[PDB]
Amino acid sequence: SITQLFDDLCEALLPAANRKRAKRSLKKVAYNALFTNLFQLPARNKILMLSFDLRVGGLGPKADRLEELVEELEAVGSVLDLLVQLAGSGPPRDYFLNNKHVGRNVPYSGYDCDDLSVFEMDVQSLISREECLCHSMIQETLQVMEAAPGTGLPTVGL
Amino acid sequence: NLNAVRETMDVLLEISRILNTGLDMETLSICVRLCEQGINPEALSSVIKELRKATEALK
Amino acid sequence: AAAAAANLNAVRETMDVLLEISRILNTGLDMETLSICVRLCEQGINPEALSSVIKELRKATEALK
Amino acid sequence: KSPNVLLQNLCCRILGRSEADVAQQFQYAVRVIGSNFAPTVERDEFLVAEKIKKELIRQRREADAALFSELHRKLHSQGVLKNKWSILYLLLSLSEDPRSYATLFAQALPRDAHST
Amino acid sequence: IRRYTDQRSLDRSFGLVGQSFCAALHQELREYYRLLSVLHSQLQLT
Structure with missing residues (x-):
């Protein structure tokens, strides 16, 4: 019942490993x-309005996926009027872009050279993931090399 | 009805997952049922947003 | 202020000029619709998309005429 | 305004019918204008002025071709607009006779010599 | 490919299917020049 439906909302969105009075207070x-x-x-028009903002930032087939799914929805x-308010707030490969050597019925449009430089940024993103990781290994220990005895350690607290 | 409501729940799961909502399957079904009662959505939008700040100060 | 109301004066003049340009080339759009098209052209927009829409919405009332 | 609802404002301008009376034309417009909204062309109100002259000469009213030349002077005299190209190129796109070839006439660069 | 077309345009006994064939090899030189234009713009790379 409805006095439990807000409480079950309260439990699922609370993780675990006080926090035993807090559920009942929330x-x-x-x-x-x-x-x-x-x-x-x-209601469907607001979804069309978010798909438009997908299309302006590129990623066309994704907006076409949104709309083919709301036509059957x-x-x-x-x-959905609730869904559109939590679509902006978050938590606190394919080979057919630039290939013509497959198929037999495959387009002729020739070159692109308008986002083929942003086809090398496609690789810059992958190397920029694996270089931000090695930046997040050197800082979490450089915060340890400069420290003082028992300032974050409660073992001196015994 | 029951197969069609299963299908409409599945499609509703997909479009909230690629929009990268913080909710999950169970809380989607809860919110769907709360709107299926006739409860104002404008009020549920407040309690989800204030819970999802207030539960982290506990942890 | 006053100088912030003079900017809106220089917009109300500019729109009168845009309306004159609209009439000497003869569109079937009036001032009320044209202002919305001016809103669109402020963000920067291609008419190869827009003209098809205008010649379509004028074609969507021939069966409701 | 925000560009998503601003289309619906145009759709409710031409036909006064509601946005719940038709939803396919409106969907067709969110299909067409998005991914063709930001320019992929290089802008020129110069070149468009030089064909606005060529349109009004083609209607054989030479004084009105000089009247546009004054209205275009006024447009720069105020300086309240940034993209002066777009609207004139728009009104040029919607041109109509009140009373050939074009690929041998100047068009802008499609960014096949410039990419970022 | 350019040297061939340089002499066929002085030639006239090459029919008019040949002068449609070799005429549809002008676009195919153009697109090369387009690629090179894009490369020249971004030079100021490696």
Whole structure:
């Protein structure tokens, strides 16, 4: 029932390994903010508005995937008006781009040379992952090499 | 109805996963049921956003 | 202020000029729609896309005429 | 404005019908204008002025071809707009006769000699 | 490929399918020059 549906919302979004009084106190805040609101254009169009903002930043087939999935999702409309508010807030290969040597019915458009320099940034991203990792190994120990006895260690606290 | 509501839940899982929402399968089904009751979505948007800040200060 | 109201004056003049340019080349769009097209052209936009839309929305009322 | 809803404003401008009365034309427009919204061409209000002259000469009104030349002077006299190319190229795109060939006439660069 | 076309355009007894064949080898030199233009712009690389 509905007095449990906010509490189960409270449990799943709380991880684990006080925090045993906090669940029961946070369902109180869940009801206390339910009735702050209650005292005081279709649904699919907002999804079309976010897919447009995908298309401006590139990634066309992804926006086409969003819309082919919401055309069958018309068969829930009160869920999407909530979904669009949590689509901006987050947590706190293919070979057919530049290949014509496959198929038999394969396009002729010749060269590109307008994002083939951004086909080398495709490799710059991969090397920039594996160089940011070696930057996150040298700092987590350089914070250790300069330290003092028992300032972060509670073993001196015994 | 039941096969069609299974299919519409699956499609609803996919479009919230590529949009990279912090929610999961279970909390999607909870929120879907809460909106299926007739509860105002504008109020649920507050409790999810304030929970997802307030639960981290505990850990 | 006053100098911030004079900017809007230099926009209201500029739009009158754009309306004159619109009429001596003869579009079927009026001032109200044209202002929305001016909003679009402020962000920077290609008319190879826009003209098809205008000649389509004028073609979407021949069956509702 | 925000560019996503600004299209719907145009769609509700031409036909006054609601955005719940039709959703396919509106979807067709989010299909067409997105991935053709940011320019991939090099801008020139110069070249477009030199064909706006060629359009109004083709209608054989030479004084109005000199009237546009004054209106274009006014446009620079204010200086309240950044992209003066786009709207004139737009109004040129929607040209119509109130009363051939074009590939041998000047068009801009499609960024096949410049890439970032 | 350019040296061949340099003399065929002085030639006339090469039909008019040959002068359609070799005429559809002008675009194919052009696109090379387009590639080289893109490379020249980005030179100021390795």
